[PDB]
Amino acid sequence: SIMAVTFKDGVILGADSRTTTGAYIANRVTDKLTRVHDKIWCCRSGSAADTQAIADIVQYHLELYTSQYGTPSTETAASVFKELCYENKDNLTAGIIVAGYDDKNKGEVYTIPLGGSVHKLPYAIAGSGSTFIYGYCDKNFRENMSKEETVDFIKHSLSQAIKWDGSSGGVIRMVVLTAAGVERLIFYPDEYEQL
């Protein structure tokens, strides 16, 4: 279960920590939030191997972009992801959310489903556990939320996604992208379960 939400000061990425090989949890403390650039992160859903290989290539492309043309836009990062996902759609199972913070464009969220299509949204949810929180997220999401409101929104949303989805669980990792910098957050079962 993964989501990225834009708010007043920028954007927050959130994800569960569960990796499954069938009904067996191969890793219960997985980090599904990956940094492709200083303030451009992505949420990985689908094949761990596919999303890993894509994210590594994108990180390489944006590092080489930065060397030549300076800091890339979040839109540029999403375009590189799309280009890989779309052109290799037959051999890939990757659903990726791209979230980044510009100073001009502030917080932006691009979702890339299986097809390899791009969708720019105020907030995005994805992964097996996202199906259970479409209703909740649509009713509770507001534009220009505060940091604390957005953290609560993601925490409550993923809490429900984890509760119903067997494929989701463990800790809720979050990554806050603002002008201030990059902040990593973690939330343990004992907290979010009894929300």
Binding site: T19, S45, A48
Partner: peptide, 4 residues
């Protein structure tokens, strides 16, 4: 395989 490993596969949220």
């Amino acid at each position: 395989x490993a596969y949220x």
